[PDB]
Amino acid sequence: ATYAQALQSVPETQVSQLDNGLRVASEQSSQPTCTVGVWIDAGSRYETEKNNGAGYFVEHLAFKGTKNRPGNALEKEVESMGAHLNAYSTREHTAYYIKALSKDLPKAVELLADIVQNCSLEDSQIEKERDVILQELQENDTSMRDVVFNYLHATAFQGTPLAQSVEGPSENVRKLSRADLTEYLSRHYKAPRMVLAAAGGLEHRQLLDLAQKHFSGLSGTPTLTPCRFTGSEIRHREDGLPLAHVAIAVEGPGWANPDNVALQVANAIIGHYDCTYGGGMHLSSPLASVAVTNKLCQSFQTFNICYADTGLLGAHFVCDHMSIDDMMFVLQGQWMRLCTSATESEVVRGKNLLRNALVSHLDGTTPVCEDIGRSLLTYGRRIPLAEWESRIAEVDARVVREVCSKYFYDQCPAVAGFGPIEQLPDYNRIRSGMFWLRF
Amino acid sequence: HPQDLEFTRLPNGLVIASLENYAPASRIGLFIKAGSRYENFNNLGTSHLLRLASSLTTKGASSFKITRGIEAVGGKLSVTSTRENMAYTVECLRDDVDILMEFLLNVTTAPEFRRWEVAALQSQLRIDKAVAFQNPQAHVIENLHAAAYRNALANSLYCPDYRIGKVTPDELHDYVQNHFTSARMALIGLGVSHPVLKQVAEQFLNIRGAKAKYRGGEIREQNGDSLVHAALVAESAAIGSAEANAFSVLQHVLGAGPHVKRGSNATSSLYQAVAKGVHQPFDVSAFNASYSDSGLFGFYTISQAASAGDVIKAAYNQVKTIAQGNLSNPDVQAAKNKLKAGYLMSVESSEGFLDEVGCQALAAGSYTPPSTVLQQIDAVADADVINAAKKFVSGRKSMAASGNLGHTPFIDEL
Amino acid sequence: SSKWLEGIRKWYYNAAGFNKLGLMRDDTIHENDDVKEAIRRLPENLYNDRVFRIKRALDLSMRQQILPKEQWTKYEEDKFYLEPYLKEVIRERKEREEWTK
């Protein structure tokens, strides 16, 4: 039992294509469960200004009455067979996945097809879901992290529609016509841009047979421009709240580069810290180590988010308004340490951390099926983890500091501040401390 | 994958289960019967401290070298616990399990309890108690267990107020030496070979009061956060009994986890009954905790300030009219399907499988496969459900109320 | 050879001086980071006895009066308590340097 033999021991995610442009993929496992989902590339990038949050509103309306079942009979059938439903959407993608059982499968696949193609629009439910989204805005005007990331995207993609949130304006919410909703559902979904994916204890042959049984005959028949990254700083002086939330990012490279894997090794060097970790004075990453030594921060993560061949290489920390300056100073110090003066054993340790993080990331059936959907959306295909292991073996510290010299060294970043952010320096201080003069 | 787990009861008392799946993740789960009920008034809040005592120095490896080695091989070490189960999980890839096993055995067998780490961990206890109870719901749960029994099951998972700082390392050494025995340890391995586990556990362990009583009553935490939390719980049954499985069928009848996010859960009759009763956005969920001697069955409601007692009356009269013979047999089978769905789809990954196999092996003393467990679920009748609901209505009540409690029934206003 | 060596050692201890001012080995250490760490890790009663002896020693240096004859901590009544603590702190300094190596 070795590592290459373990990476040899993996199911293969057999694929097929229904000739509407529909893509379908499956991967089997020997435990009695399955996860069956539909991924459609429909986020805020494809929406317009006056049509913001359309697909989010559709997946709100997705279970309130169809052209076969009423609004409660769908819930009745799902809960009578005992399924697990979930639906979400990014600024790019849209997903509907059911954690499902190993015997209630074909009727549920027909249910999912009816979710796809015949979402009826009851006017009682358009009123109720308008007020529900009002309640959701009222509730989620408090969770500070999502407000931070929405401010980050807003200051990152200024003018371009990627900066728009998934929620969008409330002025759109108070004018949601059924006609534009039908037009949106009829246009932004149909022929090439949808993937069925199934991971768990089933058969791929019968999976394509049920796809033939229900998803065949869908019979469907002009976007993705390069988005200008601005790079700027938005700040919300709002002193009523006790803590402070500061994020900073640059333009992420995307998907078609192994330099993304190198940047994931860099974030494996730094990444996350929370103040409740067992052992603070003994941590490997020096940023959190000196932060424990000086009691500055509460939490951070330095990480990546990849949009469609673009994105935000980001770093967010929650801390106190007396602990921002030295926080940012040692943060930029670790940045430029990875950009020029990285050693080798920390890179080896980060490669092992990235291995273990990816392996524990892809456990269960939901993250596996999510991974299949996201791989076949960004690439059209799935890259198994042995190729990721080979490209991990393709990484030394010299290539890492080359890529970090490419994506950090005197950029024009995007900084978002939220709270009592008086201690937060001016943008030119970030620009001065960005590039080393070798001090 | 034709291979299976292996069971071994080594005669000084410990349990060993091994599994070789050709999955890269190797996990070692070490479970100990050292929960909150095995601590008392002289060691209040000590399980919280020992749960935070993961980063101590060991006679054999200092905690600096421990932390740097475990994160140098990249494996993840975590300490999780319930009121009967301490749990050490160490995960990595399948070749470097030996040194991580050595660190785990050093932490379990030989803690040092050096005093400066104990003081820094008192400060960490303060921080961790803040992080725990800044969520309200677990605080309601802990006050419910405080209202549940007159004895050691009411010991919280977290340290009390005045107890911070005044706990000695000598009581820690004593609690280790009389509560970490060979006959109270289960060793579960996923992804690794049996004989290495057996030989190393044979190498480096070499170690070697009663049940709690019902109390009943209420605990009111007047806090006023515009959402009344109300928990009404009676005492049900011990662990693994057919009576407790009947209560599990009953809570799947009453209400389970939200299967339809952004939906309404039109099948669970508690939600539609209270939505008939109160036309305001509420939340009702069922609850059943199981323990080695006893068990706690009831429900938990989150409602408005002036809209709590009507919700409680609606839920209680719904449970009464279910108890008095208004329940469908396809609804019983749907509760069976929800129980099978929860028990299958909570153990799919290595984490839930680890937890279930370890608790099953440490509790019963052997393994039993999940297929015949589902068959035991399928061997549950209806008079079980009626008697479980009658027992819930009949016996002495226990109530934990918190929030703006100006509209809450006390005893007589049920 | 052996005991005459110990005679030289006792001669140096009696010629040093702090025996006449009520001090031990662990009262005459120059501070670094590691020494201050070892002082921080001390037990309670040892800490109080140490600071009391230090305060008496600095007072008797202040009025420049050395103790009478039979109030002198002679040879081999002292307690070498700091050597495990400070030894382990230097050992941990070497441990950090060996992990970084």
Coordinates of N, CA and C in Angstrom, one line a residue, chain A residues 56-223:
Chain A
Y56 N -30.8 33.4 -9.1 CA -31.1 33.2 -7.7 C -32.5 33.3 -7.4
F57 N -33.3 34.2 -8.0 CA -34.7 34.2 -7.8 C -35.4 33.0 -8.5
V58 N -34.8 32.4 -9.5 CA -35.4 31.2 -10.1 C -35.3 30.0 -9.2
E59 N -34.1 29.9 -8.6 CA -33.9 28.8 -7.7 C -34.6 29.0 -6.3
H60 N -35.0 30.3 -6.1 CA -36.1 30.5 -5.1 C -37.4 30.0 -5.6
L61 N -37.7 30.2 -6.8 CA -39.0 29.7 -7.3 C -39.0 28.3 -7.8
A62 N -37.9 27.6 -7.6 CA -37.8 26.3 -8.2 C -38.6 25.2 -7.6
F63 N -39.3 25.4 -6.5 CA -40.0 24.3 -5.8 C -41.3 24.8 -5.3
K64 N -42.0 25.7 -6.1 CA -43.2 26.3 -5.7 C -44.3 26.1 -6.7
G65 N -44.3 24.9 -7.4 CA -45.3 24.6 -8.3 C -44.8 24.4 -9.7
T66 N -44.9 23.3 -10.3 CA -44.5 23.0 -11.6 C -45.6 22.7 -12.6
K67 N -45.3 22.3 -13.8 CA -46.3 21.9 -14.8 C -46.9 20.5 -14.6
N68 N -46.4 19.8 -13.6 CA -47.0 18.5 -13.2 C -47.5 18.5 -11.8
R69 N -46.6 18.9 -10.9 CA -47.0 18.9 -9.5 C -47.2 20.3 -9.0
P70 N -48.1 20.5 -8.0 CA -48.2 21.8 -7.3 C -47.1 22.1 -6.4
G71 N -47.2 23.2 -5.6 CA -46.1 23.6 -4.8 C -45.7 22.7 -3.6
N72 N -46.7 22.0 -3.1 CA -46.5 21.1 -2.0 C -46.4 19.7 -2.3
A73 N -46.9 19.2 -3.5 CA -46.8 17.8 -3.9 C -45.4 17.4 -4.2
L74 N -44.6 18.4 -4.7 CA -43.2 18.1 -5.0 C -42.4 17.8 -3.7
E75 N -42.7 18.7 -2.6 CA -42.1 18.5 -1.3 C -42.6 17.2 -0.7
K76 N -43.9 16.8 -1.0 CA -44.5 15.6 -0.5 C -43.8 14.4 -1.1
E77 N -43.5 14.4 -2.4 CA -42.9 13.2 -3.0 C -41.4 13.1 -2.6
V78 N -40.7 14.3 -2.5 CA -39.3 14.3 -2.1 C -39.1 13.8 -0.7
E79 N -40.0 14.2 0.2 CA -39.9 13.8 1.6 C -40.5 12.5 1.9
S80 N -41.5 12.0 1.0 CA -42.0 10.7 1.2 C -41.0 9.6 0.7
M81 N -40.3 9.9 -0.3 CA -39.2 9.0 -0.6 C -37.9 9.3 0.3
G82 N -37.9 10.5 0.9 CA -36.9 10.8 1.8 C -35.6 11.1 1.1
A83 N -35.5 12.3 0.4 CA -34.3 12.7 -0.2 C -33.7 13.9 0.5
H84 N -32.5 14.3 0.0 CA -31.9 15.5 0.6 C -31.6 16.5 -0.6
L85 N -32.2 17.6 -0.5 CA -32.2 18.6 -1.6 C -31.3 19.8 -1.3
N86 N -30.5 20.3 -2.2 CA -29.8 21.5 -2.0 C -29.6 22.2 -3.4
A87 N -29.6 23.5 -3.3 CA -29.4 24.4 -4.5 C -28.7 25.6 -4.2
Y88 N -27.8 26.1 -5.0 CA -27.0 27.3 -4.8 C -26.6 27.9 -6.1
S89 N -25.9 29.0 -6.0 CA -25.4 29.7 -7.2 C -24.2 30.6 -6.8
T90 N -23.2 30.6 -7.6 CA -22.1 31.6 -7.4 C -22.4 32.8 -8.3
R91 N -21.4 33.7 -8.4 CA -21.4 34.7 -9.5 C -21.2 34.1 -10.9
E92 N -20.8 32.8 -11.0 CA -20.6 32.2 -12.2 C -21.6 31.0 -12.4
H93 N -21.6 30.1 -11.5 CA -22.3 28.9 -11.7 C -23.7 28.8 -11.0
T94 N -24.4 27.7 -11.3 CA -25.7 27.5 -10.7 C -25.8 26.0 -10.5
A95 N -26.2 25.5 -9.3 CA -26.2 24.1 -9.0 C -27.5 23.7 -8.3
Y96 N -27.9 22.4 -8.6 CA -29.1 21.8 -8.0 C -28.7 20.4 -7.8
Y97 N -28.3 20.0 -6.5 CA -27.9 18.7 -6.3 C -28.7 18.0 -5.2
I98 N -29.1 16.8 -5.4 CA -29.9 16.0 -4.5 C -28.9 14.9 -4.0
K99 N -28.6 14.9 -2.7 CA -28.1 13.7 -2.0 C -29.3 12.7 -2.0
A100 N -29.1 11.6 -2.7 CA -30.2 10.7 -3.0 C -29.8 9.3 -2.6
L101 N -30.9 8.4 -2.5 CA -30.8 7.1 -2.0 C -30.5 6.1 -3.2
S102 N -30.1 4.9 -2.9 CA -29.8 4.0 -3.9 C -31.0 3.2 -4.5
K103 N -32.2 3.6 -4.2 CA -33.4 3.0 -4.8 C -34.5 3.9 -5.3
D104 N -34.5 5.1 -4.8 CA -35.6 6.1 -5.3 C -35.1 6.9 -6.5
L105 N -34.2 6.4 -7.3 CA -33.4 7.2 -8.3 C -34.2 7.6 -9.5
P106 N -34.9 6.8 -10.3 CA -35.4 7.2 -11.6 C -36.5 8.2 -11.5
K107 N -37.4 8.1 -10.6 CA -38.4 9.1 -10.4 C -37.8 10.4 -9.9
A108 N -36.8 10.4 -9.1 CA -36.1 11.6 -8.7 C -35.4 12.3 -9.8
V109 N -34.9 11.5 -10.7 CA -34.2 12.0 -11.9 C -35.3 12.7 -12.8
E110 N -36.5 12.1 -12.9 CA -37.6 12.7 -13.6 C -38.0 14.0 -12.9
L111 N -38.0 14.0 -11.6 CA -38.3 15.2 -10.8 C -37.3 16.3 -11.1
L112 N -36.0 15.9 -11.2 CA -34.9 16.9 -11.5 C -35.0 17.5 -12.9
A113 N -35.5 16.6 -13.8 CA -35.8 17.1 -15.2 C -36.9 18.1 -15.2
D114 N -38.0 17.8 -14.4 CA -39.1 18.7 -14.2 C -38.7 20.0 -13.5
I115 N -37.7 19.9 -12.6 CA -37.1 21.1 -12.1 C -36.4 22.0 -13.1
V116 N -35.7 21.3 -14.1 CA -35.0 22.0 -15.1 C -36.0 22.7 -16.1
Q117 N -37.0 22.0 -16.6 CA -37.6 22.5 -17.8 C -39.0 23.1 -17.6
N118 N -39.7 22.9 -16.5 CA -41.1 23.3 -16.3 C -41.3 24.0 -15.0
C119 N -40.4 24.9 -14.6 CA -40.6 25.7 -13.4 C -41.8 26.7 -13.6
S120 N -42.9 26.5 -13.1 CA -44.1 27.4 -13.3 C -43.9 28.6 -12.3
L121 N -44.6 29.6 -12.7 CA -44.5 30.9 -12.0 C -45.8 31.3 -11.5
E122 N -46.2 30.9 -10.3 CA -47.4 31.3 -9.6 C -47.2 32.6 -9.0
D123 N -48.2 33.5 -9.2 CA -48.1 34.9 -8.9 C -48.2 35.1 -7.4
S124 N -48.9 34.3 -6.7 CA -48.8 34.2 -5.2 C -47.4 33.9 -4.8
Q125 N -46.7 33.0 -5.4 CA -45.4 32.7 -5.1 C -44.3 33.7 -5.5
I126 N -44.6 34.5 -6.6 CA -43.7 35.5 -6.9 C -43.8 36.6 -5.9
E127 N -45.0 36.9 -5.3 CA -45.1 37.8 -4.2 C -44.5 37.4 -3.0
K128 N -44.7 36.1 -2.6 CA -44.1 35.5 -1.4 C -42.6 35.5 -1.5
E129 N -42.0 35.1 -2.6 CA -40.6 35.0 -2.7 C -39.9 36.4 -2.8
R130 N -40.7 37.4 -3.4 CA -40.2 38.8 -3.3 C -40.0 39.2 -1.8
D131 N -41.0 38.9 -1.0 CA -40.9 39.3 0.4 C -39.9 38.4 1.2
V132 N -39.7 37.2 0.7 CA -38.7 36.3 1.3 C -37.3 36.9 1.0
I133 N -37.1 37.4 -0.2 CA -35.8 37.9 -0.5 C -35.6 39.3 0.2
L134 N -36.6 40.0 0.5 CA -36.6 41.2 1.4 C -36.1 40.7 2.8
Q135 N -36.7 39.6 3.3 CA -36.3 39.1 4.6 C -34.9 38.6 4.6
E136 N -34.4 38.0 3.5 CA -33.1 37.5 3.4 C -32.1 38.6 3.4
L137 N -32.4 39.7 2.7 CA -31.5 40.9 2.7 C -31.5 41.5 4.1
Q138 N -32.6 41.6 4.8 CA -32.7 42.1 6.2 C -31.9 41.2 7.2
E139 N -31.9 39.9 7.0 CA -31.1 39.0 7.8 C -29.6 39.1 7.5
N140 N -29.3 39.0 6.2 CA -27.9 38.9 5.8 C -27.2 40.2 5.6
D141 N -27.8 41.3 6.1 CA -27.1 42.6 6.2 C -26.3 42.6 7.6
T142 N -26.0 41.4 8.2 CA -25.3 41.4 9.4 C -24.0 40.5 9.3
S143 N -24.1 39.4 8.6 CA -22.9 38.5 8.4 C -21.8 39.2 7.7
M144 N -20.8 39.6 8.4 CA -19.8 40.6 7.9 C -18.9 40.0 6.8
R145 N -18.7 38.7 6.8 CA -17.7 38.1 5.8 C -18.2 38.2 4.4
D146 N -19.5 37.9 4.2 CA -20.1 38.0 2.8 C -20.2 39.4 2.3
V147 N -20.4 40.4 3.3 CA -20.4 41.8 2.9 C -19.0 42.2 2.5
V148 N -18.0 41.6 3.2 CA -16.6 41.9 2.9 C -16.2 41.4 1.5
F149 N -16.6 40.1 1.2 CA -16.3 39.6 -0.2 C -17.1 40.2 -1.3
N150 N -18.3 40.7 -1.0 CA -19.1 41.4 -2.0 C -18.5 42.8 -2.2
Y151 N -18.0 43.5 -1.2 CA -17.2 44.7 -1.4 C -15.9 44.5 -2.1
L152 N -15.3 43.3 -1.9 CA -14.0 43.0 -2.6 C -14.3 42.8 -4.1
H153 N -15.3 42.1 -4.5 CA -15.7 41.9 -5.9 C -16.1 43.2 -6.5
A154 N -16.9 44.0 -5.7 CA -17.4 45.3 -6.2 C -16.3 46.3 -6.5
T155 N -15.2 46.3 -5.6 CA -14.1 47.2 -5.9 C -13.1 46.5 -6.9
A156 N -13.3 45.2 -7.1 CA -12.3 44.5 -8.0 C -12.7 44.6 -9.5
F157 N -14.0 44.6 -9.8 CA -14.4 44.5 -11.2 C -15.3 45.7 -11.5
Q158 N -14.9 46.9 -11.2 CA -15.7 48.1 -11.2 C -16.2 48.5 -12.6
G159 N -17.5 48.6 -12.7 CA -18.1 48.9 -14.0 C -18.5 47.6 -14.7
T160 N -17.7 46.6 -14.8 CA -18.0 45.3 -15.4 C -19.0 44.6 -14.6
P161 N -19.9 43.8 -15.2 CA -20.9 43.1 -14.4 C -20.5 42.0 -13.5
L162 N -19.2 41.7 -13.4 CA -18.7 40.7 -12.5 C -18.7 41.2 -11.0
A163 N -18.6 42.6 -10.9 CA -18.6 43.2 -9.6 C -20.0 43.1 -9.0
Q164 N -21.0 42.9 -9.8 CA -22.4 42.7 -9.2 C -22.5 41.5 -8.3
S165 N -23.2 41.7 -7.3 CA -23.5 40.6 -6.3 C -24.5 39.6 -6.9
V166 N -24.6 38.4 -6.3 CA -25.7 37.5 -6.6 C -27.0 38.1 -6.2
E167 N -27.0 38.8 -5.1 CA -28.2 39.4 -4.6 C -28.7 40.6 -5.5
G168 N -27.7 41.5 -5.8 CA -28.1 42.6 -6.6 C -28.9 43.7 -5.9
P169 N -29.5 44.6 -6.7 CA -30.2 45.7 -6.0 C -31.6 45.3 -5.6
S170 N -32.0 46.0 -4.5 CA -33.4 45.8 -4.1 C -34.4 46.5 -5.0
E171 N -33.9 47.5 -5.8 CA -34.8 48.1 -6.8 C -35.2 47.1 -7.9
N172 N -34.3 46.2 -8.2 CA -34.6 45.1 -9.1 C -35.7 44.2 -8.4
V173 N -35.5 44.0 -7.1 CA -36.4 43.1 -6.4 C -37.8 43.6 -6.4
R174 N -38.0 44.9 -6.2 CA -39.3 45.5 -6.2 C -39.9 45.7 -7.6
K175 N -39.3 45.1 -8.7 CA -39.9 45.2 -10.0 C -39.8 43.9 -10.8
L176 N -39.7 42.8 -10.1 CA -39.4 41.5 -10.7 C -40.7 41.1 -11.6
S177 N -40.6 41.4 -12.9 CA -41.7 41.0 -13.8 C -41.5 39.5 -14.1
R178 N -42.7 38.9 -14.4 CA -42.7 37.5 -14.8 C -42.1 37.4 -16.2
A179 N -42.3 38.4 -17.1 CA -41.9 38.3 -18.5 C -40.4 38.2 -18.7
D180 N -39.6 39.1 -18.0 CA -38.2 39.0 -18.0 C -37.7 37.7 -17.4
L181 N -38.4 37.2 -16.4 CA -38.0 35.9 -15.7 C -38.2 34.8 -16.7
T182 N -39.3 34.7 -17.4 CA -39.5 33.7 -18.4 C -38.4 33.8 -19.6
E183 N -38.1 35.0 -19.9 CA -37.1 35.2 -21.0 C -35.7 34.8 -20.5
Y184 N -35.4 35.1 -19.3 CA -34.1 34.6 -18.7 C -34.1 33.1 -18.6
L185 N -35.1 32.5 -18.2 CA -35.2 31.0 -18.0 C -35.1 30.3 -19.4
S186 N -35.7 31.0 -20.4 CA -35.7 30.4 -21.8 C -34.4 30.6 -22.5
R187 N -33.6 31.6 -22.1 CA -32.4 31.9 -22.8 C -31.2 31.3 -22.2
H188 N -31.0 31.5 -20.9 CA -29.6 31.3 -20.3 C -29.4 29.9 -19.8
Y189 N -30.0 28.9 -20.3 CA -30.0 27.6 -19.7 C -29.8 26.4 -20.7
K190 N -30.2 26.6 -22.0 CA -30.7 25.4 -22.6 C -29.7 24.4 -23.2
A191 N -29.0 24.8 -24.3 CA -28.5 23.7 -25.1 C -27.1 23.2 -24.7
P192 N -26.0 24.0 -24.7 CA -24.7 23.4 -24.5 C -24.2 23.4 -23.1
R193 N -24.9 24.2 -22.2 CA -24.3 24.7 -21.0 C -24.8 24.0 -19.7
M194 N -25.1 22.7 -19.8 CA -25.6 22.0 -18.7 C -25.0 20.7 -18.5
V195 N -24.7 20.3 -17.3 CA -24.0 19.1 -16.9 C -24.8 18.3 -15.9
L196 N -25.2 17.1 -16.1 CA -25.7 16.2 -15.1 C -24.5 15.4 -14.6
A197 N -24.5 15.2 -13.3 CA -23.4 14.5 -12.7 C -23.9 13.6 -11.5
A198 N -23.4 12.4 -11.4 CA -23.9 11.4 -10.5 C -22.7 10.7 -9.8
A199 N -22.5 10.8 -8.5 CA -21.4 10.2 -7.8 C -22.0 9.3 -6.7
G200 N -21.6 8.1 -6.7 CA -22.1 7.2 -5.6 C -22.5 5.8 -6.1
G201 N -23.2 5.1 -5.3 CA -23.5 3.7 -5.6 C -24.6 3.5 -6.6
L202 N -24.3 3.7 -7.9 CA -25.2 3.4 -9.0 C -24.5 2.8 -10.2
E203 N -25.2 2.7 -11.3 CA -24.6 2.2 -12.5 C -24.6 3.2 -13.6
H204 N -23.5 3.4 -14.3 CA -23.4 4.5 -15.3 C -24.2 4.1 -16.5
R205 N -24.4 2.9 -16.9 CA -25.2 2.4 -18.0 C -26.6 2.8 -17.8
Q206 N -27.2 2.4 -16.6 CA -28.5 2.8 -16.3 C -28.7 4.3 -16.1
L207 N -27.6 5.0 -15.7 CA -27.6 6.4 -15.6 C -27.8 7.1 -16.9
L208 N -27.1 6.6 -17.9 CA -27.3 7.2 -19.3 C -28.6 6.7 -19.8
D209 N -29.1 5.5 -19.4 CA -30.5 5.1 -19.8 C -31.6 6.0 -19.3
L210 N -31.4 6.4 -18.0 CA -32.4 7.3 -17.4 C -32.3 8.7 -18.0
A211 N -31.0 9.1 -18.4 CA -30.9 10.4 -19.1 C -31.6 10.3 -20.5
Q212 N -31.5 9.1 -21.2 CA -32.2 8.9 -22.4 C -33.7 8.9 -22.1
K213 N -34.1 8.4 -21.0 CA -35.6 8.3 -20.7 C -36.2 9.7 -20.4
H214 N -35.5 10.6 -19.8 CA -36.1 11.8 -19.3 C -35.4 13.1 -20.0
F215 N -34.1 13.2 -19.9 CA -33.5 14.4 -20.4 C -33.4 14.5 -21.9
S216 N -33.6 13.4 -22.6 CA -33.6 13.4 -24.1 C -34.9 14.1 -24.5
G217 N -34.8 14.8 -25.7 CA -35.9 15.5 -26.2 C -36.0 16.9 -25.6
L218 N -34.9 17.4 -25.0 CA -35.0 18.8 -24.5 C -34.9 19.8 -25.6
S219 N -34.1 19.5 -26.6 CA -34.1 20.2 -27.9 C -33.9 21.7 -27.9
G220 N -32.7 22.1 -27.4 CA -32.4 23.5 -27.3 C -31.5 23.9 -28.5
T221 N -31.5 25.2 -28.8 CA -30.8 25.8 -29.9 C -30.4 27.2 -29.7
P222 N -23.0 33.3 -26.4 CA -22.6 34.6 -26.9 C -22.1 35.6 -25.8
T223 N -21.2 35.2 -25.0 CA -20.8 35.9 -23.8 C -19.3 35.6 -23.6

